Design a protein around this ligand. Structure first.
Ligand SMILES: C=C1CS[C@H]([C@@](C=O)(NC(=O)Cc2cccs2)OC)N=C1C(=O)O
Length: 354
């Protein structure tokens, strides 16, 4: 009977949300009391029409950053990576540059000072390294938070190299298989292309994300809501799957305070019980610089917190939130990018109903 009540709550919020934002398709996955509920709505593609099903793959954009963090954490608990070491310690071509004074932790917490977007002209590793060797932050690393795809890219690159593999092999051959996420990909295979939803951009054109340099680390994941709910459950220790569980949990370590949030290793967290005003403010930090204050010793992974991450691409919008103390979590996937405040408000209303 709790299943029907949850479905009513979700239906009543998602259907008006899709109508007013012209979202073609959504999947919403909820976990509570050890049980999983998956609700699918609308169309994965308009023409030819295809419904959202249990197998539908969505782009998740910036949610991909948490997989780079999980990989770095795995390297750390495996003794291959020290987060307090400098980036140039692991990337010898950057020795003598600004990255002598940037830690791996800094790129894992958006405190290096690197900008949000990769310069558009950077196509290959030679161009990337020339940019990084010439780069200087406006403030000292560790003093401000600037959300960065470039920093995330370095975090994943360094983690993979420390494990002896490419980032693509690290994710698709080790991390996702060991998490049981068998319908999660950086590159969708031919037998799954029929399941890969189209995204609909601001002009309502069908689009798929273009993968550029260090893009897999920052925005490359395509996945089902069921696989992401497994990822949420693994982050709450609910699944058998010991290094992997240690790695997942350690990504929730709190390293910096900024505004309303605690910045973990890519994950962000808020106090629980959660204030909706503070949750909205905390999810409006992607494009501006803020002051960052270190938490030292770091805050251990907590139960009594709201942990979350947003993601989008030109054609998709995604959100994950979970509260370990209540073993509850939510995944919301859509094939239109609609505003973060609406994602977070719907998620807050669903989890508050439980
Ligand atoms: C406001 C934000 C939050 S942050 C988000 C995000 C992660 O979701 N976009 C992507 O991952 C997909 C990419 C598009 C171009 C390079 S990447 O990070 C840039 N984008 C934006 C944006 O308005 O562009």
């Amino acid at each position: 009977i709790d299943e029907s009540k949850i479905k009513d709550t979700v239906d009543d919020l998602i259907q008006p949300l899709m109508q007013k934002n012209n979202i073609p398709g959504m999947s919403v996955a909820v976990t509570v009391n050890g049980k999983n509920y998956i609700y699918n709505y609308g169309l994965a593609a308009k023409q030819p029409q295809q419904p959202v099903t249990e197998n539908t793959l969505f782009e998740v954009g910036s949610l991909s950053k948490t997989f780079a963090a999980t990989l770095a954490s795995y390297a750390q608990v495996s003794g291959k990576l020290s987060l307090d070491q400098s980036v140039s310690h692991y990337v010898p071509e950057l020795r003598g540059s600004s990255f002598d004074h940037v830690s791996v932790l800094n790129v894992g917490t958006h405190t290096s000072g690197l900008q949000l977007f990769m310069p558009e002209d950077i196509k290959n590793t030679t161009q990337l390294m020339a940019y990084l060797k010439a780069w200087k932050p406006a403030d000292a690393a560790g003093t401000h938070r600037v959300y960065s795809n470039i920093g995330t890219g370095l975090l994943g690159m360094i983690a993979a190299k420390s494990l002896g593999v490419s980032y693509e092999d690290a994710i698709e051959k080790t991390l996702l298989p060991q998490l049981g996420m068998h319908h999660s990909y950086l590159k969708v295979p031919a037998d799954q292309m029929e399941n890969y939803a189209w995204g609909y951009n601001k002009k309502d054109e069908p689009v798929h994300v273009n993968m550029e340099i260090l893009g897999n680390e920052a925005y490359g994941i395509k996945t089902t809501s069921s696989d992401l709910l497994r990822y949420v459950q693994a982050n709450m220790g609910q699944l058998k799957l010991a290094k992997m569980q240690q790695a997942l949990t350690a990504t929730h370590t709190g390293y910096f305070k900024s505004g309303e949030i605690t910045q973990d290793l890519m994950w962000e967290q808020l106090p629980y019980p959660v204030s909706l005003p503070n949750l909205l403010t905390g999810n409006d930090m992607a494009m501006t610089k803020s002051v960052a204050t270190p938490i030292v010793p770091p805050l251990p992974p907590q139960e009594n917190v709201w942990i979350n991450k947003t993601g989008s691409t030109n054609g998709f919008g995604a959100y994950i939130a979970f509260v370990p103390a209540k073993k509850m979590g939510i995944v919301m996937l859509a094939n239109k990018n609609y505003s973060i405040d609406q994602r977070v408000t719907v998620a807050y209303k669903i989890l508050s109903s439980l």
